[PDB]
Design a protein around this ligand. Structure first.
Ligand SMILES: *[C@@H]1O[C@H](CO)[C@@H](O[C@@H]2O[C@H](CO)[C@@H](O)[C@H](O)[C@H]2NC(C)=O)[C@H](O)[C@H]1NC(C)=O
Ligand SMILES: *[C@@H]1O[C@H](CO)[C@@H](O[C@@H]2O[C@H](CO)[C@@H](O)[C@H](O)[C@H]2NC(C)=O)[C@H](O)[C@H]1NC(C)=O
Ligand code: NAG
Ligand code: NAG
Ligand code: NAG
Ligand code: CL
Ligand code: ZN
Length: 612
């Protein structure tokens, strides 16, 4: 649109390109700021006006992106990839990829419409009770808490089913259309489908195989945490609802998607009657503010000689579900406005331990932003999406330790023994191990939708194939191809790639090891706490300050000593409980896995009318 943001004109030289990029950066910062700020208004407030606006701002960006896009390749496309300066050719290579901008005007508009709509359908969805046409439940908070702490099978079933129908069914038709378009766009950028484009970010001709191999190494870990919990669950709901030889029913693991079981710790905790490793109740006791949480998280960050939250962040962030009745996308996220000034976090935070680490997780994104803000805009990325999701989790590892919790107030004791040690490790196992299958599975499903191996005619049938197959969980009520359970997961509607969370969970420990070593810690990897270690923090920040300038595979070597992802440091972390669980299941005759696939639990007695 605006002429001042249009390209200009340059030499089909590498010296021309150095200039081309220098320019793009100054202009792009504007066009990106606007589009980002527009969204920030829509997410922090969902109105038809803001959506319209957003959809507009997107059109400009798509406009901008095309101009420099087709220009950068107008004359820099038979030669880049042979440029001396790696950073330069990695920038030009980021610009030559138009993305959605390659789509005719009508189609961009359809595109942008789908996006703001799906995210709207996803965050507006509600679950209403049968007869009481009285006030509905919302994914956050109502639904989450019910899955996090309600032990009523029927009740959980009502919310699990409620949410999955409510969010999925309407989303399906739009998803199929978004996919057709998304592909069409990147098809022109040279990739087969968006799937291939998404994986090209790791630069590894071997990515998928490295991941499949990496999973086998860990599968045994999951299968054991699984049979152990499946047993604990049988113990509580009985023999009618839990099959000791079948997949677990998806709504009993204490989380809507069964992606992390840390909320059922009190039902599987091996050695109970000991100090409780869930500050979640001491946080309330002390009167923890939602802000108080973003301060403790910050404090850790500062001690490692890393920068604190800027004032803009404190003035412009939304750290609580507002009260003006405004409707917001409650999912926690971190925002980079590409203006080296504005960095904020959007999260309907309330006072919970699992929420205290999500705060750290998010700060990790902000800290990554603050660190690389001084690089060409097109390089303000993590080494790879994985590194980004890792950053806050790493520091989280040190925070979760019982020794650290005490140092800061919520673990009233200190019981240095095995039993407590096992409990801790199991708790962490419920959070990190239980997730591995899911994290893998999601983009497994998607790469196949984008490629056509999973047409809308098999959206749900291929989703539960993957879910049963990897998580060993099954749907509590029957399902069919009018359903779209994959769509009930925030990340599918809001088009976010997922294979990054897997990478993240595996290489967050490589970091944890590497950092604990420079901190000068010795003792066990799972009891390490890099707190106040300016030496450790300096090691981390070198990776941060690199953005997408250098290949992750190099930025990783410098920091960890390895050319790639490794589960070894992860196995070393959970070692004790790894052997413990394994020994426990055997004695108790458990069966690792689900041989009775195809098994489904029956409905509550009169469905669906009871104490919800
Ligand atoms: C990309 O362009 C932005 C915008 O000019 C650059 O950021 C500025 O940095 C200078 C100092 O180097 C400050 O005086 C400005 O206030 C910053 N923003 C503005 C408004 O210009 C950034 O350095 C450029 N990146 C590269 C590598 O060229
Ligand atoms: C998919 O399975 C669901 C669950 O059984 C089906 O929905 C029920 O079907 C009856 C009629 O057979 C309706 O009265 C209900 O309203 C439906 N849902 C509920 C809340 O029970 C659905 O028909 C199935 N879809 C297909 C095409 O087989
Ligand atoms: C919510 O969005 C509306 C219109 O998009 C806007 O007028 C209002 O200011 C926003 N809510 C606020 C500010 O509390
Ligand atoms: C998105 O929602 C708006 C508002 O109802 C509607 O006008 C538009 O057609 C929707 N887009 C799609 C493709 O669903
Ligand atoms: C309490 O929460 C409010 C609302 O976010 C915030 O303004 C205030 O700084 C918080 N106080 C503390 C000490 O956390
Ligand atoms: Cl990714
Ligand atoms: Zn994240």
């Amino acid at each position: 649109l605006d002429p001042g943001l249009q390209p200009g004109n340059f030499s089909a030289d590498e010296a021309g390109a150095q200039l081309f990029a220098q320019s793009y950066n100054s202009s792009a910062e504007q066009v990106l700021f606007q589009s980002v700020a527009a969204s920030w208004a829509h997410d922090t407030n969902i109105t038809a006006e803001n959506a319209r606006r957003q959809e507009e701002a997107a059109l400009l960006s798509q406009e901008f992106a095309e101009a420099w896009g087709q220009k950068a390749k107008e004359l820099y496309e038979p030669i880049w990839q042979n440029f001396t300066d790696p950073q330069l050719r990695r920038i030009i290579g980021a610009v030559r990829t138009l993305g959605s901008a390659n789509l005719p005007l009508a189609k961009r508009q359809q595109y942008n419409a789908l996006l703001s709509n799906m995210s709207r359908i996803y965050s507006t969805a509600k679950v209403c009770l049968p007869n009481k046409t009285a006030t509905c439940w919302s994914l956050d908070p109502d639904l989450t808490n019910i899955l996090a702490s309600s032990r009523s099978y029927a009740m959980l079933l009502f919310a699990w089913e409620g949410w999955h129908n409510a969010a999925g069914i309407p989303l399906k038709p739009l998803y199929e259309d978004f996919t057709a378009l998304s592909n069409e766009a990147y098809k022109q950028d040279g990739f087969t489908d968006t799937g291939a484009y998404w994986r090209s970010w790791y630069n590894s001709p071997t990515f998928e195989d490295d991941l499949e191999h990496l999973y086998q190494q860990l599968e045994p870990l999951y299968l054991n945490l699984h049979a152990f919990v499946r047993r604990a669950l049988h113990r509580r709901y009985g023999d009618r609802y839990i099959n000791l030889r079948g997949p677990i029913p998806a709504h009993l693991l204490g989380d809507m998607w069964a992606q992390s079981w840390e909320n059922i710790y009190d039902m599987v905790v091996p050695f109970p009657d000991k100090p409780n490793l869930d500050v979640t109740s001491t946080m309330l006791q002390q009167g923890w503010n939602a802000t108080h949480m973003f301060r403790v998280a910050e404090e850790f960050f500062t001690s490692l000689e890393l920068s604190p939250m800027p004032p803009e962040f404190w003035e412009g962030s939304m750290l609580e579900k507002p009260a003006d009745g405004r409707e917001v996308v409650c999912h926690a996220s971190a925002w980079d406005f590409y203006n080296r000034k504005d960095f904020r976090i959007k999260q309907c935070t309330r006072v919970t331990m699992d929420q205290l680490s999500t705060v750290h997780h998010e700060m990790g994104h902000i800290q990554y932003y603050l660190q690389y803000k001084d690089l060409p805009v097109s390089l303000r990325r993590g080494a790879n999406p994985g590194f980004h999701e890792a950053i806050g989790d790493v520091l989280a590892l040190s925070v979760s330790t019982p020794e650290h919790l005490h140092k800061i107030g919520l673990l009233d004791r200190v019981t240095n023994d095995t039993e407590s040690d096992i409990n801790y490790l199991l708790k962490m196992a419920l959070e990190k191990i239980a997730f591995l299958p899911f994290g893998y599975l999601v983009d497994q499903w998607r790469w196949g939708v984008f490629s056509g191996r999973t047409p809308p005619s098999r959206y749900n049938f291929d989703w539960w194939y993957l879910r049963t197959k990897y998580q060993g969980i099954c749907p509590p009520v029957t399902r069919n191809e009018t359903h779209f359970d994959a769509g009930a997961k925030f990340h599918v509607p809001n088009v976010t790639p997922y294979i990054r969370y897997f990478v993240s969970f595996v290489l967050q420990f490589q970091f944890h090891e590497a950092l604990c070593k420079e901190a000068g810690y010795e003792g066990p990897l799972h009891q390490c706490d890099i707190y106040r270690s300016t030496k450790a923090g300096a090691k981390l920040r070198k990776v941060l300050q690199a953005g997408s300038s250098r290949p992750w595979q190099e930025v990783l070597k410098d920091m960890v000593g390895l050319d790639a992802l490794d589960a070894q440091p992860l196995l070393k972390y959970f070692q004790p409980v790894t052997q413990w669980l394994q020994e426990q299941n055997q004695q108790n005759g458990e069966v690792l896995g689900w041989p009775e696939y195809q098994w489904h639990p029956p409905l509550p007695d009169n469905y669906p009318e009871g104490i919800d």
